[PDB]
Amino acid sequence: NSTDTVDTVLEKNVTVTHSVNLLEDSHNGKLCLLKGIAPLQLGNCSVAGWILGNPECESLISKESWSYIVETPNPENGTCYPGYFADYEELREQLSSVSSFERFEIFPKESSWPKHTVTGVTASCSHNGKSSFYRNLLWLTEKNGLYPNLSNSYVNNKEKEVLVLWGVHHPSNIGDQRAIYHTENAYVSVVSSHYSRRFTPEIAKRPKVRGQEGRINYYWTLLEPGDTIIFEANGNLIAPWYAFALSRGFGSGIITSNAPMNECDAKCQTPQGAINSSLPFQNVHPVTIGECPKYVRSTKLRMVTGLRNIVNSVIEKMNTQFTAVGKEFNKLERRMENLNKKVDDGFLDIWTYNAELLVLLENERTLDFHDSNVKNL
Amino acid sequence: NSTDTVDTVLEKNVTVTHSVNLLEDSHNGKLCLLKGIAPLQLGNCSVAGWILGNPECESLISKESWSYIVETPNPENGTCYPGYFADYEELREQLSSVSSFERFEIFPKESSWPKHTVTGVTASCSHNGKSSFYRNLLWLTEKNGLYPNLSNSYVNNKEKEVLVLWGVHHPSNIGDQRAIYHTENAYVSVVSSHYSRRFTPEIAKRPKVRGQEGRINYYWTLLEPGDTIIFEANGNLIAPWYAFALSRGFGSGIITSNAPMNECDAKCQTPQGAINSSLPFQNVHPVTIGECPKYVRSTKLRMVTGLRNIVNSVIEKMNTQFTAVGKEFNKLERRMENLNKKVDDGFLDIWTYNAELLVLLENERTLDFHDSNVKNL
Amino acid sequence: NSTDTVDTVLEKNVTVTHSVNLLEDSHNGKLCLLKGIAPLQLGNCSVAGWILGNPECESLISKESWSYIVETPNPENGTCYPGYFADYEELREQLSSVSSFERFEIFPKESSWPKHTVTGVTASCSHNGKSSFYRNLLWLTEKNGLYPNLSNSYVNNKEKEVLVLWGVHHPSNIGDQRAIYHTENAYVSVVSSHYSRRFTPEIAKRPKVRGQEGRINYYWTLLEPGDTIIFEANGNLIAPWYAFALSRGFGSGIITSNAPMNECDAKCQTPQGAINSSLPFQNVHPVTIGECPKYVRSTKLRMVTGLRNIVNSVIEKMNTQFTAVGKEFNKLERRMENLNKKVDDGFLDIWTYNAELLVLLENERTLDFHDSNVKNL
Amino acid sequence: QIQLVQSGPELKKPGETVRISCKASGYTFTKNGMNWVQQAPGKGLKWVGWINTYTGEPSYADDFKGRFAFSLETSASTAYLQINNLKNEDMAAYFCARMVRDAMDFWGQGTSVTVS
Amino acid sequence: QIQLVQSGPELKKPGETVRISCKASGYTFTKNGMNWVQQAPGKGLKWVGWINTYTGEPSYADDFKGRFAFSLETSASTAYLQINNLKNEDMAAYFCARMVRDAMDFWGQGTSVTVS
Amino acid sequence: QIQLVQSGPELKKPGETVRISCKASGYTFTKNGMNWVQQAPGKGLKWVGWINTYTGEPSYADDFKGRFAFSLETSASTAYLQINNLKNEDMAAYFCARMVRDAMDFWGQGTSVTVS
Amino acid sequence: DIVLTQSPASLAVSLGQRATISCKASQSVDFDGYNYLNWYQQKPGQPPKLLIYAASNLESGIPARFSGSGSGTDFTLNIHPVEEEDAATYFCQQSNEDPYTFGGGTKLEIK
Amino acid sequence: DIVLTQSPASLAVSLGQRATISCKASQSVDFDGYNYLNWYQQKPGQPPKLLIYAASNLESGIPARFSGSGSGTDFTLNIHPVEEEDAATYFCQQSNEDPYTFGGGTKLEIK
Amino acid sequence: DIVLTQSPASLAVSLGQRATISCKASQSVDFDGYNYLNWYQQKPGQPPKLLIYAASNLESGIPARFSGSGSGTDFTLNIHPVEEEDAATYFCQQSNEDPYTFGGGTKLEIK
Ligand SMILES: *[C@@H]1O[C@H](CO)[C@@H](O[C@@H]2O[C@H](CO)[C@@H](O)[C@H](O)[C@H]2NC(C)=O)[C@H](O)[C@H]1NC(C)=O
Ligand SMILES: *[C@@H]1O[C@H](CO)[C@@H](O[C@@H]2O[C@H](CO)[C@@H](O)[C@H](O)[C@H]2NC(C)=O)[C@H](O)[C@H]1NC(C)=O
Ligand SMILES: *[C@@H]1O[C@H](CO)[C@@H](O[C@@H]2O[C@H](CO)[C@@H](O)[C@H](O)[C@H]2NC(C)=O)[C@H](O)[C@H]1NC(C)=O
Ligand SMILES: *[C@@H]1O[C@H](CO)[C@@H](O)[C@H](O)[C@H]1NC(C)=O
Ligand SMILES: *[C@@H]1O[C@H](CO)[C@@H](O)[C@H](O)[C@H]1NC(C)=O
Ligand SMILES: *[C@@H]1O[C@H](CO)[C@@H](O)[C@H](O)[C@H]1NC(C)=O
Ligand SMILES: *[C@@H]1O[C@H](CO)[C@@H](O)[C@H](O)[C@H]1NC(C)=O
Ligand SMILES: *[C@@H]1O[C@H](CO)[C@@H](O)[C@H](O)[C@H]1NC(C)=O
Ligand SMILES: *[C@@H]1O[C@H](CO)[C@@H](O)[C@H](O)[C@H]1NC(C)=O
Ligand SMILES: *[C@@H]1O[C@H](CO)[C@@H](O)[C@H](O)[C@H]1NC(C)=O
Ligand SMILES: *[C@@H]1O[C@H](CO)[C@@H](O)[C@H](O)[C@H]1NC(C)=O
Ligand SMILES: *[C@@H]1O[C@H](CO)[C@@H](O)[C@H](O)[C@H]1NC(C)=O
Ligand SMILES: *[C@@H]1O[C@H](CO)[C@@H](O)[C@H](O)[C@H]1NC(C)=O
């Protein structure tokens, strides 16, 4: 009859008459839609360039609901002014469950900061040849040759978590600290109900990254509903302009992919392409979004149906989803990166041996129950 | 005969004559004793309110030996003065192996701090209408209008680890810092043989938590036997009064439960209730204390004994105990919280598939070895 | 015939005629060579004493290529001046993949630090009776009664990662801070392209560790190829003398062992001794280096070959290597230490149950396929 | 609703002892302390002391130390004040009051102790 | 190679409107702005304003607000400057230039607008 | 127990060379250095230099540089001091001593070198 | 002992006036920004009644015409508009250090 | 508006001289250590040509005899050796605050 | 070179006196709070004997009547009660900078 073959416990390559292939190994190499809701496509932007509101990532400001976030590997435009990002990899874990925004102003410019000027632009964040700055942050400078102290509160009326973002400037000279902020011993104190931190600038000459020898360290927090955050500074404050009322979702995530964007409909999605199948398992990628087959590190997995010519128990028990690309951890987190890669590769090898042995067990019981009735009849 | 049924690899719901149920699914919904030794019942207290010695948790000061610690979900009285708790979730991992105390005074009041007054009470920690303070800490204030520098050592003569606890006051005004401590640039330096840290207050106006706009950050360390800790401050010190000589045990832990306390005897204990059984597995809760059955996420698991009418290999190999409730990790530890929930739910699904397949394997070998001898005879 | 026995699913201790033992349980208790390349033997030195260049670990300065690193349990000579080591356990994870050095001078003495004296020796690091200091660090002191400010850059021309090491002195008196560095408010600022930190001394009187009441905290970083690091200080700097161009390897690691060093050739290595075998599994130790059998927590594992007288599917899927000794984590990392011991002991019990059940499955199919043909013939 | 009822007025001779009661109701007797305030008509209020109802530990002022002694009966909600023994001084009224927030918000009806 | 060609010279009467063109080529029209510089012979260069080619948002100086108005045609690479309407002042040359690094590096050939 | 025995007294003429020995015993020869102290009777002690026994690297004072040269024999426990060549100055006694804690605790019996 | 001196002795007030009763402590009665000064009202033949606790919060059940303020050692009680039912004696009481100390009293007589 | 004053009006230079053209702004034209001062060269009958951008970097395509420096408000343009083809008018232009402002010009005539 | 001057030249002492031998260095002989000053005793016809190492610790094998103290540049050696067997010459020696330098000596003669 046919030429399909199965593998068994003792013998392999058994020529049989019928088989069901439990592996979907193919995919359309594009980023199709998830149900009808289009994903978020950062393009040449980082996660850090998207929430800080890079001047070259203005086309993503308008989009506030998505199916998943698509980041490109080695993304060029993000954090245009050089500096640290305090708990950047922790914030990507927060934004891997957020399914909706509400980009609003906490401290509205032209009404919120009197006695200061909000026109602070840098040549590292230049947009269309002219120097610009972030779309969600304000660089406060002097007004009438004076930088007085500031104070602003914000009570969370939004009935949701509010992600507040700010930054502290770290200059390169002491003649530049006096020229902008007119004080040499400055501070930033951002307090809340369950948050309190005080920042102090560090004036030092750095290697030139994007042309600047000074740094801006970016910070964040998560306001609770009904809670108050109080900003207070003597200088060196890159002040919050916009923020986000966070709406949490269950099926979402950040994938890293170079696939072209198409207009499809799908049910599953991997960084190599979407999957349209009803088969139980897959070989494409462990990182899936949507209702998807289960990942096994196999190439040949068939269950025999008929005689030879001379599985829900595993799918119910996997229940784990892998999100690791290599962007999840830090320079100074390698004992936790090697622990995450031990756990992820350990569950991908237990559940591959479990799925293969159940096929090997069911193949010998099928071939001898079929060869039971040949001698009854 | 009977109506009990078993499940097998190929077919299910096989009507048989005899069966042994390997699942204990029931429990008396109370917190009975462990062997004869009564647990520690915090009641309306946190872990943080118990070791800091809250004024409303005075009834637990007398108890210094227990079987396990019972915390209620959402516990109201703990940390009565608002503020941080440095490595609070790390200290709960230390106190999950401590089986005995010895609450003693490191620095005995009325003998240990001359030139200072130890009568510092706050209205957030009020007890019986009158304002009070913690039972294990001392708020040092001025004496005769002077706050001089302090210095006190303590050599560990107790032949055991000593958990030292202190705190640093962070006021709300600069007119309040001068009123209590009479200095504006104060410090606290707590050094040891393998510990050294210097603390500096942060004067800022906070949102009102429990009526106060100032904070007290609580710190801790673990003295080794034979070791010396040296306290030194210019101001802002909430000084150690009492401390604990730690006696470590193997079978213990902190459970979170709302169950009523009864006077029983048991051998096992879960947050839903104790277990009196000899069966191998269970369905009640994965968090167990004492010699207990093994947790499987199953509902029906029977091993057939007799013919049909028309397990120590798994128990020896589990050997893992789950302690995760949701109080183990932080706001800024979600990559480790999602990693702990991936490991815990991964081992609860490998060992459920392993325990179910061994029953499925032993059921078909029993039914055909019993149907072997029907044709010999 | 023979007296070897096998175990099966239902019955055990089945007397058979032939068997293959799949467990190598013996080892020559020595540290033999790996292929021909000799290991690194620290002896009475820590990892911290080896890269800081202890005066008593001078015999390891000459060796710059190895197979693996052998540390003794409780190693006495390392960090001779007392103090912290910032991310010491993280640096041991970096040096567990480094297979070659190039010990070179970043800042060459007698040419690199004018207006300072580099002859700073302490009595804790004494070598041959005379007080000395580390071989890879320079304690800069005054010259002509003046300690001026310093500044030195280093551009990475080595086409490899460069591990830079320095330290900050923390004195015990303020009359000792003025005697060495002539300033009371000193700083150290070590900046780079993707690194920036500012250090400030903490003058406090400590318990005497190795005779000193002052501390030196040791720091490190990893320069990228083509990158610049800029040192700048007003005082309290223990300056970099030597550094290491890092060459990364795949098969390496740090083992902890008390075994005598022999001159053998081997293919495998454990902390108890090398392994010369072709068997699939082992019982000796989970920490292996080289091509090795797989660790199972078993004592008896035989596969039957012949009739009774009255495995690559598991080895392909293990693919994990355990490196945990107890030196990997900290005082304040016990939630990650207990998580690493849950993952390591969990995979050692899943893969022991998987390897034993596959032997139990293959033993009953062998004994009845052999007893199939006794009734055909 | 909260109420503190006391005993009736007493008439003693200087040399014997008096015992004043204060029957609390409407709230839990422990979780709230019990002050004792002496109103002498013509002099003003004075603070005798405070008794912890949870602990049982009294705390007196030094002008009221030695003779005045507080007691408890927490089985019911009753606090006691015994003077040992009365002079022709402290012929006054005696209020029992309640600690809520470092204060005395719910007072008693007053026990006029007359010394004849 | 980068080039900005303009329209020819124009001759108007004071009271009607003129429209100047600037055909860019050799580079992407968006990702670079477009200045407009007025050279009056005998007075020197003056900055009329700047138009964002990506956004379309103009920004004028106050001396050129109200009459001068920039426009775009990004389908091709062409920018426009319309004056409404010409006086006998602003009889000048008009250069279109390009923003690269807060500067004007590639200029136009000049459009001599004569008002008669 | 620790002991450092030396050679006997020597009698030379100014122009030839002398060689002094110092046989250590009772301790490991490496892990401890070896000083050389010149006692001239009538002037006081002077420090010739120090030799590392582990390394072999000598270190002299400048008044003893050029003529005085230390040597080792670590196979046994013996250190050597050779002068090349003797003047009628440095007619003195020569002690070999041991470094323990920046000090010279165990000394030799003294080698009286007389220059005639 | 913190001794508190009421001022004035007693004040004459008509209906619609502003009555200001003040007491000044010898030491400071605040700690960590919490003034421990309570204000009491006693009609004759009756127990005193707590009005304002520590040192500006008004107790529930008291009409909002009563308001007090002050910090450190100087505190005032202000009554406006003075209704006729306020014919009582007013005490201030500290709760900072033991023993607790009252004032001298001040009769509010209404014309 | 930042007004910039060229100095001198126009300078007489022979071939081989050092021509120094300077302009001094009224306010400061730097922010965070980036001087926003560009230098332009206009031959008559031609558009101006960018030489030096902000405020010392030389543009590609310009000969290396041009160099400019300065910080804050005072900037100079230095030309040596002066070849004969530099007979043009020189403008300086700020880019700090809107609107952008040019200089007055300076003719470099060669003997 | 750190030159050390003993004081006095030699002292007259009877049995039961307090003998104070002092030496003052030209520079400082301490670094990081460790005084590098050793004290030696030489009987004639014998090698010197280390008594006190750096600068107050007493070596094992030396009687506890010897004690020395001092910091910076000034150090003293104090002997009480002076037994008769202390008829020797006393040297102080620095170990801070190379070369090591001794004192001049001081004879302790007993009456
Ligand atoms: C946005 O990204 C582009 C790259 O896509 C950056 O442009 C580069 O800028 C550097 C100078 O910093 C040049 O050396 C490169 O040649 C530029 N590349 C390209 C293709 O233009 C740009 O600077 C980034 N801008 C922001 C705001 O982040
Ligand atoms: C102990 O816990 C009780 C709650 O059990 C706290 O009492 C609450 O206090 C707040 C004011 O901070 C009131 O708004 C609530 O109405 C109170 N609830 C009850 C039921 O009394 C008390 O403050 C806590 N005390 C300490 C020392 O922690
Ligand atoms: C190197 O290690 C040795 C131990 O191997 C250290 O020597 C010890 O030093 C302490 C004083 O700090 C003495 O109490 C011990 O008796 C010594 N032990 C031995 C066997 O000598 C030595 O100090 C270490 N040196 C360095 C440079 O680290
Ligand atoms: C089955 O066929 C495949 C063909 O690639 C071969 O690699 C494999 O070894 C065969 N297995 C057996 C057991 O015949
Ligand atoms: C990314 O950047 C390159 C170079 O600037 C550009 O050609 C490309 O179109 C950009 N892609 C997106 C998605 O904007
Ligand atoms: C999946 O494939 C089926 C069969 O070819 C097709 O009918 C269906 O439209 C596909 N689904 C999607 C989402 O395109
Ligand atoms: C067995 O009976 C249960 C009754 O709830 C049913 O849900 C299940 O599907 C049955 N299984 C089979 C295979 O008959
Ligand atoms: C917990 O607090 C509530 C409210 O104060 C109280 O009713 C209850 O008795 C408390 N429980 C315990 C265990 O003290
Ligand atoms: C467990 O149950 C058995 C049988 O009912 C009973 O005899 C025994 O007392 C129980 N154990 C406990 C701890 O109550
Ligand atoms: C097999 O023999 C071993 C001998 O040690 C014994 O411990 C084990 O219980 C025996 N097993 C059976 C099932 O006979
Ligand atoms: C380790 O130290 C001990 C004591 O100093 C010594 O005897 C031994 O030889 C040392 N071992 C090595 C490897 O140097
Ligand atoms: C050295 O650094 C300090 C602190 O930065 C500074 O105040 C001082 O002026 C510097 N000295 C020199 C020579 O620059
Ligand atoms: C391993 O054992 C074999 C057989 O005894 C021997 O021939 C071989 O040399 C051994 N290998 C090594 C590395 O010594």
Report on the architecture of this protein.
Chains A, B, C: This is Hemagglutinin HA1 chain. The complex is a heterononamer, with three copies of chain A (377 residues), three copies of chain D (116 residues) and three copies of chain G (111 residues). Chain A is of the alpha+beta class and 377 residues long. Chain A has helices at residues 48-51, 88-94, 174-180, 312-318, 337-370, 373-376, and strands at 5-6, 14-15, 19-21, 23-24, 40-43, 69-71, 98-100, 103-105, 122-127, 130-132, 137-139, 150-155, 161-170, 188-191, 196-199, 215-223, 228-233, 237-240, 242-248, 254-256, 281-282, 294-295, 302-304. In chain A, the strands form seven sheets. In chain A, strands 7, 8, 11, 13, 16, 18 and 19 form a seven-stranded antiparallel β-sheet that branches. In chain A, strands 12-17-14-15 form a four-stranded antiparallel β-sheet, with no helix packed on it. In chain A, a hairpin with a 7-residue loop joins strand 1 (5-6) and strand 2 (14-15). The two termini of chain A are 22 Å apart. Chain D is mostly beta strands. Chain D has a single domain, classed as Immunoglobulin-like, CATH 2.60.40. Helices cover 0% and strands 47% of the residues of chain D. Chain D has strands spanning 3-6, 10-12, 18-25, 34-40, 44-51, 58-60, 68-73, 78-83, 93-97, 111-115. Chain D has a six-stranded mixed β-sheet with strand order 2-10-9-4-5-6, with no helix packed on it. Chain D has a four-stranded antiparallel β-sheet with strand order 1-3-8-7, with no helix packed on it. Chain D is globular. The termini of chain D are far apart. Chain G has 111 residues and is an all-beta fold. In chain G, 0% of the residues lie in helices and 50% in strands. Chain G has strands spanning 4-7, 10-13, 19-25, 30-31, 34-35, 37-42, 49-53, 57-58, 66-71, 74-79, 89-94, 101-102, 107-110. The termini of chain G are far apart. At the C-I interface, helix 3 of C face strand 4 of I. The complex binds a molecule of 2 linked components (NAG-NAG) (3 copies) and 2-acetamido-2-deoxy-beta-D-glucopyranose (10 copies). A molecule of 2 linked components (NAG-NAG) binds at residues 44, 54-56, 76-77, 80, 125, 210 of chain B. One 2-acetamido-2-deoxy-beta-D-glucopyranose is lined by residues 43-44 of chain A.
